[PDB]
Amino acid sequence: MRECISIHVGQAGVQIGNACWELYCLEHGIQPDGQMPSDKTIGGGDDSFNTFFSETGAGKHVPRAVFVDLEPTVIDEVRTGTYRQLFHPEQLITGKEDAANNYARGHYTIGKEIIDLVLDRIRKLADQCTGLQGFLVFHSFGGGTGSGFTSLLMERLSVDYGKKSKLEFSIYPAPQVSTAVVEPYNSILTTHTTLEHSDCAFMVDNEAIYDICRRNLDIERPTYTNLNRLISQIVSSITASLRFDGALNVDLTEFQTNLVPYPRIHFPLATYAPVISAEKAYHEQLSVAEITNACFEPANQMVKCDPRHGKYMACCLLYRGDVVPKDVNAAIATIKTKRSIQFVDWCPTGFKVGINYQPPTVVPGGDLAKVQRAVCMLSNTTAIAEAWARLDHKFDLMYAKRAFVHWYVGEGMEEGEFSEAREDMAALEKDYEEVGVDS
């Protein structure tokens, strides 16, 4: 067994991290006080769920998790929440005043002050690990902390843990879900600074989550709780293979091996189905063919884009519930003859498939209904570059007038870092075009 440490930075990373660990405890039968009746080895073990939980002599299962926010109000709702007893004080880290939606303030001004503390508290978790695999980092692209401090931390994690893998779950900004006007700046700045320190990054576009919440849960104006509980379902689908018995994506290195042939093109598209309203009394249970077909519907993707106008490098299908290989291959054969599914020429046209028989867990009283089967598709397609092009375009509009730039220079950042960052994203966009388009 090899351990994974989760790190949650800024408001989005913390509040999403709250939802995930709530879900993880439900999936594993761990009560809010940290007790786990199913676990018969008291105070130790190297089961699969021990990758994410350590154990005390008292029998308490403790998340290998750190929560970090440069303001105390969000983390305080963990301290005093439903799982207070799960975490211990050392894992919740709050500063005094936040980064004010400003990457440069989160990265340079406040980050300097707090990085050594955060690294020290992570070291206390790494020391309890007999074989640390690396880190899962949850954060927004857009926040001052989520963008500015995350990038400083990722740089320092590559220093202090050079051999360890680092995975990201990144919340990509969408005006429908309250955004700062400078979020394009923050997004580009932090992608540039984090690009070479992350081995695999799952972008989640708030616009996509928001619309799924409106369309499939028929919530008229979804809350952060609605958004985060759906996001946590997808995150849990992605991390299940680390926490349960299985042979696919069983450690962080396999994510890179299976999803990322080229280190810079390391942003897989996630597509999830089905998402069913819980106040919908009687709903037909979707079949393997249907939920697999729904994986090629842009309306189910975590980032809206058109994979038909791009090329695939890698594709993993992650099923939960009543699913057998026979049905998967039937559904795939059908889909190959009707969908437009082009792989690059230097890659096998195929699917790695993982099945966990336990159907998804939902939060009692949440807006998602139990289903008897679901699937998360992870595909590395060049079509996700549409998300970069969109963001890059908004950055250009504002930067052409140097709008807001003075806030960043006033924190000690050189204007040249904007151009550095933007030029990196320009290369990134052209790497995608080289890989996935022909003239």
Binding site: T73, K96, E97, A100, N101, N102, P175, S178, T179, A180, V181, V182, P184, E220, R221, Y224, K394, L397, M398, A400, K401, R402, A403, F404, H406, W407
Partner: protein, 423 residues
């Protein structure tokens, strides 16, 4: 994240005391400082404006160079609630003279004020910055107030400075020297504030006369408008919710270039109350953005919105708010700049003000504000070309050169706003 409020001069302390009456009510604080409210959103962020026998005390400093108006605050409805040591006043007055407030009378009193500021700042767990109420047309709020702002910046250079600045108008004038005092003050604000709400007495008078059909508006009528605006514009600072704003995020998001930090507020429904028909969300959005509803006498259709922040208060359809807000931009896209994407943001708060089941308040950084600085510049120039009334200022040690430089800096400001109306 505590705010320290300072109110200076006659106007400053009058609209200041109304602000505290209004929000004290909204948070359930009675004149004696004891909380007797019925909801817990009221107390959740109460410490932003109040210090804590479980009584709440405004973190407010009351400043004036003559004792009159502050005797009136101490006798007013909520007068008991202010900390007695936070009244800081002299005897001489400022004679509606910027130089007296800034250089002679005010200089004598400013260190006493900073001692009270310092004491309030020390009892702060994490000081956000300062909020000052004042007019620009008099002597104490204008001259001493900008002197305070400068001294505060020097002692707290990493904190935010926010002002509600009442701009003078010939339609509601006390003295002819108001353009001089206002021009000298704007120069101070361009340099030493991060955010200034322009509260234009011309716009308030027009609104009282035309819309509210009050034919003889008093300062009490004008101040009813300012009170409603100050409450709405501070809502997201004082109440918990979706979006918990603060002074620094305000400035980062609304100010694309450091000198263009002068905002036009807007409010709906405009009231003198007397009406029980609550407005539909479409109507709030329509009126709020109507020129006849903005507290600065500027035509937004003569300029462009750089940034806009709107807050809707009461119980109403979030879905309908977003629809109407998006409607207004998508129907007049010409009045929003292309080079700041998604520059209109909207918040909601369930807790309506008093006497209203729903309201809307608008914060706008519009290039049309240049019209207000032009108006002042014209009035300034009409007198200054003849050096009229200047002896009031040279008698206090000032030289004409200082007026010339202030005129120049304000014309520069007008130019800069026009530069981005044509971008």
């Amino acid at each position: 994240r505590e705010i320290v409020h300072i109110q200076a001069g006659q106007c400053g302390n009058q609209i200041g005391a109304k602000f505290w009456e209004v929000i004290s009510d909204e948070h359930g604080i009675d004149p004696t400082g004891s909380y007797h409210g019925d909801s817990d959103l009221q107390l959740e962020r109460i410490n932003v404006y109040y210090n804590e026998g479980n009584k709440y005390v405004p973190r407010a400093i009351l400043v004036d160079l003559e004792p009159g108006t502050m005797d009136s605050v101490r006798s007013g409805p909520f007068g008991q609630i202010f900390r007695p040591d936070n009244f800081v006043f002299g005897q001489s007055g400022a004679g509606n003279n910027w130089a007296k407030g800034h250089y002679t009378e005010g200089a004598e009193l400013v260190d006493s004020v900073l001692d009270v500021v310092r004491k309030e700042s020390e009892s702060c767990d994490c000081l956000q910055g300062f909020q000052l109420t004042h007019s620009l047309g008099g002597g104490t709020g204008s001259g001493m107030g900008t002197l305070l702002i400068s001294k505060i910046r020097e002692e707290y250079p990493d904190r935010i400075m926010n002002t509600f600045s009442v701009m003078p108008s010939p339609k509601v004038s006390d003295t002819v020297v108001e353009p001089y005092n206002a021009t000298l003050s704007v120069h101070q604000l361009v340099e030493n504030t991060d955010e200034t709400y322009c509260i234009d007495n011309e716009a308030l008078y027009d609104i009282c006369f035309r819309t509210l059909k009050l034919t003889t508006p008093t300062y009490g009528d004008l101040n009813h408008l300012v009170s409603a605006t100050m409450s709405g514009v501070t809502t997201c600072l004082r109440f918990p919710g979706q979006l918990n704003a603060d002074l620094r995020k305000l400035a980062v998001n609304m100010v694309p270039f450091p000198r263009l930090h002068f905002f036009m507020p807007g409010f709906a429904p405009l009231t003198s109350s007397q009406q029980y028909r609550a407005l539909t969300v479409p109507e709030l959005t329509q009126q709020m953005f109507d020129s006849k509803n903005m507290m600065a006498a500027c035509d937004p259709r003569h300029g462009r919105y750089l940034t806009v922040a709107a807050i809707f208060r009461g119980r109403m359809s979030m879905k309908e708010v977003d629809e109407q807000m998006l409607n207004v931009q998508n129907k007049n896209s010409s009045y929003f700049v292309e080079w700041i994407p998604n520059n209109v943001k909207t918040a909601v708060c369930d807790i309506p003000p008093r006497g209203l089941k729903m309201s809307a308040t608008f914060i706008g950084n519009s290039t049309a504000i240049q019209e207000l600085f032009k108006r002042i510049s014209e009035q300034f120039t009409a007198m200054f070309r003849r050096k009229a009334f200047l002896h009031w200022y040279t008698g206090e040690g000032m030289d004409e050169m200082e007026f010339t430089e202030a005129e120049s800096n304000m014309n520069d400001l007008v130019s800069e706003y026009q530069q981005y109306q044509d971008a």
